[PDB]
Amino acid sequence: VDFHGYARSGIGWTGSGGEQQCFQATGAQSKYRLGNECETYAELKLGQEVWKEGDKSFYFDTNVAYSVNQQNDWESTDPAFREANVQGKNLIEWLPGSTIWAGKRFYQRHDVHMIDFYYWDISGPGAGIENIDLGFGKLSLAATRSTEAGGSYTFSSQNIYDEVKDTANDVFDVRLAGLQTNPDGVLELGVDYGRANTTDGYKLADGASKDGWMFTAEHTQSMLKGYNKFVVQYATDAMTTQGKGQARGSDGSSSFTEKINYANKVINNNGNMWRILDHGAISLGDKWDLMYVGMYQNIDWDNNLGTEWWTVGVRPMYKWTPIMSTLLEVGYDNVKSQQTGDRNNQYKITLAQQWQAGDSIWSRPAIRIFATYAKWDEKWGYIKDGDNISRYAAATNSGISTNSRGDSDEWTFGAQMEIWW
Amino acid sequence: VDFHGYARSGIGWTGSGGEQQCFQATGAQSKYRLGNECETYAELKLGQEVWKEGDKSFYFDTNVAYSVNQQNDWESTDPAFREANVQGKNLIEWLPGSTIWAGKRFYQRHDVHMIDFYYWDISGPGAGIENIDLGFGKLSLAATRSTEAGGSYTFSSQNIYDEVKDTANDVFDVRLAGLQTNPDGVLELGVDYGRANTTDGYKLADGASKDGWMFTAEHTQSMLKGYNKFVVQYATDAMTTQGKGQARGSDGSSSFTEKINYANKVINNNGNMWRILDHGAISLGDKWDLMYVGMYQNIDWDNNLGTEWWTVGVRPMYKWTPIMSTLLEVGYDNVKSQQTGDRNNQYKITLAQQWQAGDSIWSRPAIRIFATYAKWDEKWGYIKDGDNISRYAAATNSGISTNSRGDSDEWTFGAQMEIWW
Amino acid sequence: VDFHGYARSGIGWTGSGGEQQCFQATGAQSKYRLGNECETYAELKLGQEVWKEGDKSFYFDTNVAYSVNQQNDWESTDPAFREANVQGKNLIEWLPGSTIWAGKRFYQRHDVHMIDFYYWDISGPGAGIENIDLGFGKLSLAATRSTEAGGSYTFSSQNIYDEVKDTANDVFDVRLAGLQTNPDGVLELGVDYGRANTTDGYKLADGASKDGWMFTAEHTQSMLKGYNKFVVQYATDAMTTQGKGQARGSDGSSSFTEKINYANKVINNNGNMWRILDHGAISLGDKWDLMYVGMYQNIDWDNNLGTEWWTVGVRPMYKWTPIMSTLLEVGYDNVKSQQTGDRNNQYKITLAQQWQAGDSIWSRPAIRIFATYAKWDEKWGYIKDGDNISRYAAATNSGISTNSRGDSDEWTFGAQMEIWW
Ligand SMILES: [Ca+2]
């Protein structure tokens, strides 16, 4: 049996008192993680190559994920059964090298480690065939599914309905990778088409976006014993909410009963998204490693409820010895509410001493002792409709109740382990 | 560590729209599974032979089951802790070869793969001693437990009660197997006695069946590189509800509070059940494998709320190559309501292309692409008491609301993997 | 992958009827476990030495716990993710041999097996450095966390508050072990300081204890192919509720809303605890092994709601053969309510036949068949505030409703397995 996974766990304190607190700019879809993670998260994978005969083989893989608040010993939870798929290599004679697979699977996810941000993730129940050799590149095709809560109604008259149902969203993914564009440079192109797929009799409320597209281009350049990846993505309509390749075609639906059922007009995600990203990890000599990110993401919604986000961070690593190093992480976020036009910003500085299994910025396990400082100035926030956060923003100064954190300061510190095996 | 288990997961679509739908005749206790399974189910077993000294050994085994709807990546669930037992082989000197065990265990379950129907399953918390050598056969004794919700009351003044409690049902199982009846033929006999076992002070509402018997006879004939099993079972009263060997002695109990507590008269399971079954898996030459089922099951309840069920199916497998085949599954169900006398029927046809690790109809893992068509005509259904399904049936045409599917058609298609390791 | 853990599961019956019942004296913090365990409990640990280079290494360890009532086959549950930590050995050059670790961990727990009583357990999310060699002993430092529900409020005016929050309690642990006090005798000293650590803006209700201390001294004497441990422990204030090293600084807090929020007067745990314990396991010749416990524990609370507890038990084991033995367990408990002055007592006698993997009282797996008898006479009980048990006690004879079991008798019997691997 093959045992693999990922896990992080630790104990922390907030300067002003109590447990460690984590800092994320309101409106931002991520945070700089070093010394800024407040939960124990673990994915335990058990898999096995269940059959092999020549060049043909079947691999079985699973993944059970646990997320607990690390505030006590006994902490009950509802694990997420995230993967359970079979992959058969070389089964299709005329498509030598291709792999066919079916089941829940983390499918070719693309992420930026330091901000724990996935920018291309269509994972979920699915099937497909990958690595079809085209000579000049490798072609992969896949179809996965995600479902939204509600959104499908059996309308009797007008917008009055008898029943609701969860809406399934299908994604059809095509990728071409390994395009040798320049020396030590490679390019991958990808197209994603997603659409809400309603059961017979059910229909989406008026205004639902229903479908959308997403185009991805990623260039990888090998250098300084690492790489640099340049990404450009453009998503449209239904693909803008999740923004990683999954469709949210009924996003914005809602209803109210009085008992007559009324399906409100969908406050949809019609619009577009532009994401220009550049991140990498390289070695500057013998004593220094460096991870960095620079990203501009603009979700332009027709309903004007989007956000313009800029994020920049840097994580240098100084290697005192092969198993001990000092890390520093500095990250800046700036989010402009499309609605109010105001801006929220935050910068966090983290200094950590670390012992790790290897001399790389990528070596894990790692045991860290850190101190984090974050300063933010948030001018807007989402209107907090009593414990519920709304899609609408409002300036903090307006008497309206928002989830804004205002203008403040904080520092935390503690120990933590992180590992992938 | 020994890693074993079972798992199935896939993605599907319904011809008329949305996610895949699964077809099962109302009243039938099963459905023809090929291309007719709508969930990701997995059993992860981790066990180990923890001690061995000569012919003696102790094996530890566990089993954690997960069932998710495969409609998203992150799907939280409450896993079922189904097995955790220890088996000691050859510990009893005077009963050489016998195995003593205790703990939660899937005890000698008998099922028909194609319809995923267990017809002899007393699994649960238990203990026993198996494989006592009698020379002419092997004898096994076991006691397991199951518990029903409520059913036990502390009656103050006739049927008015102070407290309720869950009712434990004990089953005492005796099996004699390996009776060589004819060349390549073997016979196994089994007796099961089950009963509701109330705590002191508590009593079952008046009318409860309390106990029952079940007798099983199974003949196995080895042939055509497979087998054919002929099964005859007769169950009595408390053994008719679950109908696989577990007792439901307080089945039908209910109560209402107004606060005075009244235990209604138990609408019991007094009656009998007859099940005549024949299933098998054989090889017809080099290119063909075949699984088949034929079953008649009649639950005759004194109160007349039972069902008479006929099911017939066939699953031929044509082997294009050792790792690629085409499967066809045709299944028919006919269920007569004992109450109304009406009949429900359905036939489903499934065509699937498959790649599997081996050239057997039993080889797993397997990756399938299928198309399923089902036609049904249901004349009756259980009276749907608003989201709640009742024990009482009603003709679909009667203005009464039932869970009947009417007269209709549907087809689905998709990909799926299934594996046992 | 290293597979380890603990598990117990079985089936039982109560003489007077129904499922097995378990006997624990009201007021007592434990019960004599042999043939007195009513659930299936299992801890599945999967770990691995993920890196090794010379004398340095990193070990990754996990632990997922399951507790089910063993009353049916399919029993859903919410597993507890109890451990997830990394330990790096020999990473600190100047502290040779020391191990640094971080993550959720069962940290150096001290318990008495026969009563399943942990008397020194600060397990939970934490970090620390253990086994610092001082020459004359080993020094270990650790900080772990536990959190109480509520207890932290944002007071606006008087005991009126706007928001509540869970209260984190930090423990700072220091231990010195391996003090060679006499031939074959060793002594370990330990100090624990814990305190509720409130978030800025929040405060504990008035009356809360906030912090406390605990001092432990444990002497181990090796003899009769076993040992004898003598323990003396003294705890103060916040350390008295859990009483094993974890702090409960806001213990007793409560509130009521009418919507104005009022934080009641904390009915605190101010006071002290004295625990004098002696337990061991030794071999008396070839055919006899013996486990024993003798403990006096007195929780003296300022508010007089404490208890004075005496427990004594013995478990001899007669070895018929190397893999078969007969066990007897006799345990007595006596608990005096500090409030009422009344006493509750119970004695349970257990006779069990056992097959185990080894000839030790410590050998596991083990399969047992037992018969248990318990007699109790409880004069007091906690005031049962309708399903809810209060901190206040009342004599059974007083017309007040308490959770007292009165004066009675009961016997149970069944089979069970227990294993640690
Ligand atoms: Ca749950």
mmCIF file of all heavy atoms in Angstrom, chain A residues 145-181:
data_model
loop_
_atom_site.group_PDB
_atom_site.id
_atom_site.type_symbol
_atom_site.label_atom_id
_atom_site.label_comp_id
_atom_site.label_asym_id
_atom_site.label_seq_id
_atom_site.Cartn_x
_atom_site.Cartn_y
_atom_site.Cartn_z
ATOM 1 N N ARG A 145 -17.560 17.136 -12.705
ATOM 2 C CA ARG A 145 -18.802 17.725 -12.253
ATOM 3 C C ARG A 145 -18.695 18.413 -10.912
ATOM 4 O O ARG A 145 -17.876 18.050 -10.077
ATOM 5 C CB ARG A 145 -19.872 16.638 -12.135
ATOM 6 C CG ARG A 145 -21.118 17.119 -11.379
ATOM 7 C CD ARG A 145 -22.331 16.313 -11.712
ATOM 8 N NE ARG A 145 -22.489 16.196 -13.151
ATOM 9 C CZ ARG A 145 -22.951 15.111 -13.759
ATOM 10 N NH1 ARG A 145 -23.310 14.052 -13.045
ATOM 11 N NH2 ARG A 145 -23.019 15.070 -15.084
ATOM 12 N N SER A 146 -19.541 19.413 -10.727
ATOM 13 C CA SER A 146 -19.669 20.139 -9.465
ATOM 14 C C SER A 146 -21.179 20.424 -9.395
ATOM 15 O O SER A 146 -21.862 20.318 -10.417
ATOM 16 C CB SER A 146 -18.882 21.448 -9.487
ATOM 17 O OG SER A 146 -19.420 22.366 -10.427
ATOM 18 N N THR A 147 -21.737 20.638 -8.207
ATOM 19 C CA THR A 147 -23.154 20.961 -8.135
ATOM 20 C C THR A 147 -23.372 22.118 -7.172
ATOM 21 O O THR A 147 -22.620 22.301 -6.202
ATOM 22 C CB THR A 147 -24.075 19.746 -7.801
ATOM 23 O OG1 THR A 147 -24.080 19.492 -6.405
ATOM 24 C CG2 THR A 147 -23.597 18.517 -8.479
ATOM 25 N N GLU A 148 -24.340 22.958 -7.508
ATOM 26 C CA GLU A 148 -24.663 24.111 -6.706
ATOM 27 C C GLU A 148 -25.901 23.796 -5.916
ATOM 28 O O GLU A 148 -26.704 22.949 -6.305
ATOM 29 C CB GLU A 148 -24.946 25.293 -7.610
ATOM 30 C CG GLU A 148 -23.802 25.678 -8.506
ATOM 31 C CD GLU A 148 -24.190 26.758 -9.480
ATOM 32 O OE1 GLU A 148 -24.784 26.401 -10.515
ATOM 33 O OE2 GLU A 148 -23.900 27.949 -9.220
ATOM 34 N N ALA A 149 -26.062 24.484 -4.802
ATOM 35 C CA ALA A 149 -27.230 24.281 -3.968
ATOM 36 C C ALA A 149 -28.410 25.007 -4.607
ATOM 37 O O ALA A 149 -28.312 26.202 -4.926
ATOM 38 C CB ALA A 149 -26.970 24.813 -2.578
ATOM 39 N N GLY A 150 -29.504 24.274 -4.821
ATOM 40 C CA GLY A 150 -30.698 24.854 -5.417
ATOM 41 C C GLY A 150 -30.456 25.305 -6.840
ATOM 42 O O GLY A 150 -29.590 24.767 -7.530
ATOM 43 N N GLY A 151 -31.232 26.278 -7.298
ATOM 44 C CA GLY A 151 -31.039 26.766 -8.651
ATOM 45 C C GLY A 151 -31.911 26.113 -9.697
ATOM 46 O O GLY A 151 -32.056 26.667 -10.779
ATOM 47 N N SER A 152 -32.428 24.919 -9.433
ATOM 48 C CA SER A 152 -33.310 24.254 -10.390
ATOM 49 C C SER A 152 -34.710 24.176 -9.783
ATOM 50 O O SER A 152 -34.905 23.618 -8.685
ATOM 51 C CB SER A 152 -32.802 22.857 -10.741
ATOM 52 O OG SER A 152 -31.641 22.921 -11.547
ATOM 53 N N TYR A 153 -35.679 24.748 -10.492
ATOM 54 C CA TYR A 153 -37.058 24.789 -10.019
ATOM 55 C C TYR A 153 -38.051 24.248 -11.026
ATOM 56 O O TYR A 153 -37.855 24.357 -12.239
ATOM 57 C CB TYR A 153 -37.477 26.231 -9.731
ATOM 58 C CG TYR A 153 -36.473 27.071 -8.990
ATOM 59 C CD1 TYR A 153 -35.523 27.811 -9.677
ATOM 60 C CD2 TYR A 153 -36.493 27.155 -7.601
ATOM 61 C CE1 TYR A 153 -34.607 28.625 -8.995
ATOM 62 C CE2 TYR A 153 -35.588 27.963 -6.910
ATOM 63 C CZ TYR A 153 -34.647 28.693 -7.614
ATOM 64 O OH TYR A 153 -33.739 29.473 -6.947
ATOM 65 N N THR A 154 -39.129 23.673 -10.510
ATOM 66 C CA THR A 154 -40.218 23.176 -11.348
ATOM 67 C C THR A 154 -41.282 24.276 -11.277
ATOM 68 O O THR A 154 -42.111 24.298 -10.356
ATOM 69 C CB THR A 154 -40.824 21.870 -10.807
ATOM 70 O OG1 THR A 154 -40.736 21.848 -9.375
ATOM 71 C CG2 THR A 154 -40.105 20.679 -11.384
ATOM 72 N N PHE A 155 -41.209 25.226 -12.204
ATOM 73 C CA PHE A 155 -42.144 26.342 -12.223
ATOM 74 C C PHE A 155 -43.559 25.965 -12.648
ATOM 75 O O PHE A 155 -43.746 25.299 -13.674
ATOM 76 C CB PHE A 155 -41.622 27.458 -13.128
ATOM 77 C CG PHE A 155 -40.418 28.149 -12.592
ATOM 78 C CD1 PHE A 155 -39.228 28.150 -13.307
ATOM 79 C CD2 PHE A 155 -40.473 28.806 -11.370
ATOM 80 C CE1 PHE A 155 -38.106 28.798 -12.816
ATOM 81 C CE2 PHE A 155 -39.358 29.459 -10.861
ATOM 82 C CZ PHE A 155 -38.168 29.457 -11.586
ATOM 83 N N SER A 156 -44.543 26.381 -11.845
ATOM 84 C CA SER A 156 -45.954 26.130 -12.140
ATOM 85 C C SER A 156 -46.508 27.295 -12.985
ATOM 86 O O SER A 156 -47.095 27.091 -14.051
ATOM 87 C CB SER A 156 -46.757 25.941 -10.846
ATOM 88 O OG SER A 156 -46.581 27.027 -9.955
ATOM 89 N N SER A 157 -46.251 28.521 -12.550
ATOM 90 C CA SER A 157 -46.702 29.693 -13.281
ATOM 91 C C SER A 157 -45.802 30.843 -12.872
ATOM 92 O O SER A 157 -45.519 31.023 -11.678
ATOM 93 C CB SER A 157 -48.160 30.012 -12.935
ATOM 94 O OG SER A 157 -48.644 31.116 -13.684
ATOM 95 N N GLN A 158 -45.332 31.603 -13.857
ATOM 96 C CA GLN A 158 -44.454 32.745 -13.600
ATOM 97 C C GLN A 158 -43.202 32.248 -12.885
ATOM 98 O O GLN A 158 -42.575 31.296 -13.337
ATOM 99 C CB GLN A 158 -45.172 33.796 -12.738
ATOM 100 C CG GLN A 158 -46.479 34.327 -13.307
ATOM 101 C CD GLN A 158 -47.266 35.137 -12.287
ATOM 102 O OE1 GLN A 158 -46.724 36.023 -11.617
ATOM 103 N NE2 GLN A 158 -48.553 34.829 -12.159
ATOM 104 N N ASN A 159 -42.874 32.860 -11.751
ATOM 105 C CA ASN A 159 -41.707 32.479 -10.974
ATOM 106 C C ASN A 159 -42.105 31.758 -9.691
ATOM 107 O O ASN A 159 -41.376 31.766 -8.689
ATOM 108 C CB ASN A 159 -40.849 33.706 -10.665
ATOM 109 C CG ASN A 159 -41.602 34.766 -9.890
ATOM 110 O OD1 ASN A 159 -42.810 34.933 -10.061
ATOM 111 N ND2 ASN A 159 -40.892 35.498 -9.039
ATOM 112 N N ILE A 160 -43.284 31.157 -9.718
ATOM 113 C CA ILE A 160 -43.781 30.406 -8.581
ATOM 114 C C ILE A 160 -43.431 28.967 -8.926
ATOM 115 O O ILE A 160 -43.657 28.530 -10.061
ATOM 116 C CB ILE A 160 -45.304 30.562 -8.433
ATOM 117 C CG1 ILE A 160 -45.661 32.042 -8.339
ATOM 118 C CG2 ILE A 160 -45.788 29.846 -7.176
ATOM 119 C CD1 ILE A 160 -47.113 32.319 -8.559
ATOM 120 N N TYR A 161 -42.847 28.241 -7.974
ATOM 121 C CA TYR A 161 -42.445 26.856 -8.223
ATOM 122 C C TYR A 161 -42.942 25.876 -7.160
ATOM 123 O O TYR A 161 -43.285 26.268 -6.033
ATOM 124 C CB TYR A 161 -40.908 26.757 -8.367
ATOM 125 C CG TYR A 161 -40.145 27.031 -7.088
ATOM 126 C CD1 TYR A 161 -39.918 26.016 -6.164
ATOM 127 C CD2 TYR A 161 -39.701 28.316 -6.774
ATOM 128 C CE1 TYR A 161 -39.283 26.272 -4.955
ATOM 129 C CE2 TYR A 161 -39.052 28.582 -5.554
ATOM 130 C CZ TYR A 161 -38.855 27.550 -4.653
ATOM 131 O OH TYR A 161 -38.254 27.786 -3.439
ATOM 132 N N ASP A 162 -42.985 24.602 -7.540
ATOM 133 C CA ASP A 162 -43.412 23.540 -6.643
ATOM 134 C C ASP A 162 -42.207 22.965 -5.909
ATOM 135 O O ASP A 162 -42.214 22.876 -4.681
ATOM 136 C CB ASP A 162 -44.118 22.428 -7.426
ATOM 137 C CG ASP A 162 -45.318 22.935 -8.219
ATOM 138 O OD1 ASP A 162 -46.123 23.709 -7.649
ATOM 139 O OD2 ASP A 162 -45.454 22.559 -9.410
ATOM 140 N N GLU A 163 -41.157 22.623 -6.661
ATOM 141 C CA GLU A 163 -39.942 22.036 -6.093
ATOM 142 C C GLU A 163 -38.645 22.675 -6.567
ATOM 143 O O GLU A 163 -38.575 23.264 -7.647
ATOM 144 C CB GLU A 163 -39.879 20.540 -6.420
ATOM 145 C CG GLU A 163 -41.027 19.723 -5.878
ATOM 146 C CD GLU A 163 -41.271 18.481 -6.703
ATOM 147 O OE1 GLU A 163 -41.935 18.600 -7.764
ATOM 148 O OE2 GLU A 163 -40.790 17.396 -6.296
ATOM 149 N N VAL A 164 -37.617 22.526 -5.742
ATOM 150 C CA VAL A 164 -36.288 23.028 -6.033
ATOM 151 C C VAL A 164 -35.429 21.789 -6.136
ATOM 152 O O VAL A 164 -35.832 20.706 -5.717
ATOM 153 C CB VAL A 164 -35.678 23.806 -4.869
ATOM 154 C CG1 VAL A 164 -34.860 24.953 -5.404
ATOM 155 C CG2 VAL A 164 -36.727 24.238 -3.867
ATOM 156 N N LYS A 165 -34.203 21.963 -6.600
ATOM 157 C CA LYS A 165 -33.280 20.853 -6.725
ATOM 158 C C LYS A 165 -31.906 21.466 -6.874
ATOM 159 O O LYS A 165 -31.789 22.642 -7.235
ATOM 160 C CB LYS A 165 -33.608 20.066 -7.981
ATOM 161 C CG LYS A 165 -33.184 18.629 -7.946
ATOM 162 C CD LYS A 165 -33.402 18.000 -9.298
ATOM 163 C CE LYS A 165 -32.396 18.548 -10.258
ATOM 164 N NZ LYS A 165 -31.036 17.990 -10.051
ATOM 165 N N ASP A 166 -30.872 20.692 -6.551
ATOM 166 C CA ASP A 166 -29.503 21.154 -6.699
ATOM 167 C C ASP A 166 -29.179 21.087 -8.188
ATOM 168 O O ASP A 166 -29.665 20.207 -8.913
ATOM 169 C CB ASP A 166 -28.567 20.278 -5.894
ATOM 170 C CG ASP A 166 -28.772 20.432 -4.411
ATOM 171 O OD1 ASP A 166 -29.058 21.555 -3.954
ATOM 172 O OD2 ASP A 166 -28.636 19.428 -3.694
ATOM 173 N N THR A 167 -28.397 22.042 -8.653
ATOM 174 C CA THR A 167 -28.055 22.126 -10.060
ATOM 175 C C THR A 167 -26.657 21.614 -10.372
ATOM 176 O O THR A 167 -25.665 22.141 -9.869
ATOM 177 C CB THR A 167 -28.187 23.579 -10.491
ATOM 178 O OG1 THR A 167 -29.495 24.027 -10.133
ATOM 179 C CG2 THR A 167 -27.958 23.756 -11.990
ATOM 180 N N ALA A 168 -26.582 20.596 -11.215
ATOM 181 C CA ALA A 168 -25.310 20.007 -11.600
ATOM 182 C C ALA A 168 -24.686 20.877 -12.658
ATOM 183 O O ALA A 168 -25.394 21.383 -13.517
ATOM 184 C CB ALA A 168 -25.527 18.635 -12.149
ATOM 185 N N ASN A 169 -23.370 21.058 -12.591
ATOM 186 C CA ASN A 169 -22.624 21.858 -13.563
ATOM 187 C C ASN A 169 -21.548 20.964 -14.152
ATOM 188 O O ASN A 169 -20.752 20.385 -13.410
ATOM 189 C CB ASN A 169 -21.964 23.074 -12.905
ATOM 190 C CG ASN A 169 -22.962 24.130 -12.504
ATOM 191 O OD1 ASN A 169 -23.085 25.152 -13.156
ATOM 192 N ND2 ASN A 169 -23.685 23.888 -11.430
ATOM 193 N N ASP A 170 -21.556 20.818 -15.472
ATOM 194 C CA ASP A 170 -20.578 19.997 -16.167
ATOM 195 C C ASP A 170 -19.468 20.835 -16.767
ATOM 196 O O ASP A 170 -19.724 21.934 -17.283
ATOM 197 C CB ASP A 170 -21.242 19.253 -17.310
ATOM 198 C CG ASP A 170 -22.233 18.233 -16.847
ATOM 199 O OD1 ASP A 170 -22.084 17.703 -15.730
ATOM 200 O OD2 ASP A 170 -23.158 17.942 -17.624
ATOM 201 N N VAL A 171 -18.243 20.318 -16.725
ATOM 202 C CA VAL A 171 -17.117 21.026 -17.327
ATOM 203 C C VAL A 171 -16.480 20.065 -18.296
ATOM 204 O O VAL A 171 -16.365 18.876 -18.006
ATOM 205 C CB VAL A 171 -16.035 21.459 -16.310
ATOM 206 C CG1 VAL A 171 -14.999 22.325 -16.995
ATOM 207 C CG2 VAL A 171 -16.651 22.240 -15.185
ATOM 208 N N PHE A 172 -16.116 20.569 -19.465
ATOM 209 C CA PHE A 172 -15.464 19.762 -20.476
ATOM 210 C C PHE A 172 -14.162 20.476 -20.655
ATOM 211 O O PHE A 172 -14.118 21.651 -21.003
ATOM 212 C CB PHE A 172 -16.308 19.733 -21.723
ATOM 213 C CG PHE A 172 -17.725 19.329 -21.448
ATOM 214 C CD1 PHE A 172 -18.711 20.298 -21.228
ATOM 215 C CD2 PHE A 172 -18.075 17.982 -21.361
ATOM 216 C CE1 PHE A 172 -20.021 19.937 -20.928
ATOM 217 C CE2 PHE A 172 -19.382 17.602 -21.061
ATOM 218 C CZ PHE A 172 -20.360 18.583 -20.842
ATOM 219 N N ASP A 173 -13.108 19.760 -20.307
ATOM 220 C CA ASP A 173 -11.746 20.269 -20.294
ATOM 221 C C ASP A 173 -10.809 19.659 -21.343
ATOM 222 O O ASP A 173 -10.732 18.431 -21.483
ATOM 223 C CB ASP A 173 -11.224 20.015 -18.880
ATOM 224 C CG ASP A 173 -9.850 20.544 -18.651
ATOM 225 O OD1 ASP A 173 -8.887 19.796 -18.898
ATOM 226 O OD2 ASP A 173 -9.721 21.676 -18.158
ATOM 227 N N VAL A 174 -10.080 20.527 -22.048
ATOM 228 C CA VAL A 174 -9.121 20.121 -23.080
ATOM 229 C C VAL A 174 -7.810 20.866 -22.831
ATOM 230 O O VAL A 174 -7.800 22.093 -22.685
ATOM 231 C CB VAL A 174 -9.628 20.450 -24.488
ATOM 232 C CG1 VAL A 174 -8.649 19.984 -25.517
ATOM 233 C CG2 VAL A 174 -10.940 19.777 -24.725
ATOM 234 N N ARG A 175 -6.709 20.125 -22.805
ATOM 235 C CA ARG A 175 -5.410 20.703 -22.533
ATOM 236 C C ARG A 175 -4.361 20.171 -23.489
ATOM 237 O O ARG A 175 -4.397 19.004 -23.842
ATOM 238 C CB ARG A 175 -5.011 20.336 -21.103
ATOM 239 C CG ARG A 175 -5.674 21.155 -20.032
ATOM 240 C CD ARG A 175 -6.078 20.302 -18.860
ATOM 241 N NE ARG A 175 -5.566 20.790 -17.581
ATOM 242 C CZ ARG A 175 -6.312 21.122 -16.529
ATOM 243 N NH1 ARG A 175 -7.633 21.049 -16.575
ATOM 244 N NH2 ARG A 175 -5.718 21.440 -15.390
ATOM 245 N N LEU A 176 -3.438 21.028 -23.905
ATOM 246 C CA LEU A 176 -2.350 20.636 -24.786
ATOM 247 C C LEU A 176 -1.123 21.140 -24.066
ATOM 248 O O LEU A 176 -0.991 22.336 -23.803
ATOM 249 C CB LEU A 176 -2.483 21.302 -26.156
ATOM 250 C CG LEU A 176 -1.447 21.000 -27.259
ATOM 251 C CD1 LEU A 176 -1.289 19.504 -27.512
ATOM 252 C CD2 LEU A 176 -1.891 21.662 -28.536
ATOM 253 N N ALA A 177 -0.234 20.235 -23.699
ATOM 254 C CA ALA A 177 0.933 20.668 -22.966
ATOM 255 C C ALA A 177 2.242 20.182 -23.537
ATOM 256 O O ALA A 177 2.275 19.301 -24.411
ATOM 257 C CB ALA A 177 0.802 20.244 -21.553
ATOM 258 N N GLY A 178 3.322 20.758 -23.030
ATOM 259 C CA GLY A 178 4.637 20.373 -23.485
ATOM 260 C C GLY A 178 5.012 20.973 -24.815
ATOM 261 O O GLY A 178 5.789 20.367 -25.546
ATOM 262 N N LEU A 179 4.442 22.130 -25.148
ATOM 263 C CA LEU A 179 4.757 22.811 -26.405
ATOM 264 C C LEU A 179 6.075 23.499 -26.162
ATOM 265 O O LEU A 179 6.162 24.405 -25.323
ATOM 266 C CB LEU A 179 3.700 23.856 -26.772
ATOM 267 C CG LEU A 179 2.302 23.352 -27.114
ATOM 268 C CD1 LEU A 179 1.415 24.511 -27.467
ATOM 269 C CD2 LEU A 179 2.366 22.381 -28.266
ATOM 270 N N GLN A 180 7.110 23.016 -26.840
ATOM 271 C CA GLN A 180 8.450 23.566 -26.708
ATOM 272 C C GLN A 180 8.520 24.880 -27.498
ATOM 273 O O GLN A 180 8.652 24.880 -28.718
ATOM 274 C CB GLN A 180 9.463 22.549 -27.233
ATOM 275 C CG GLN A 180 10.847 22.650 -26.599
ATOM 276 C CD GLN A 180 10.898 22.083 -25.187
ATOM 277 O OE1 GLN A 180 10.568 20.911 -24.968
ATOM 278 N NE2 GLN A 180 11.318 22.908 -24.222
ATOM 279 N N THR A 181 8.400 25.998 -26.795
ATOM 280 C CA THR A 181 8.417 27.304 -27.422
ATOM 281 C C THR A 181 9.794 27.937 -27.531
ATOM 282 O O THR A 181 10.054 28.725 -28.429
ATOM 283 C CB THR A 181 7.508 28.272 -26.656
ATOM 284 O OG1 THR A 181 7.818 28.205 -25.257
ATOM 285 C CG2 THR A 181 6.057 27.905 -26.862
#
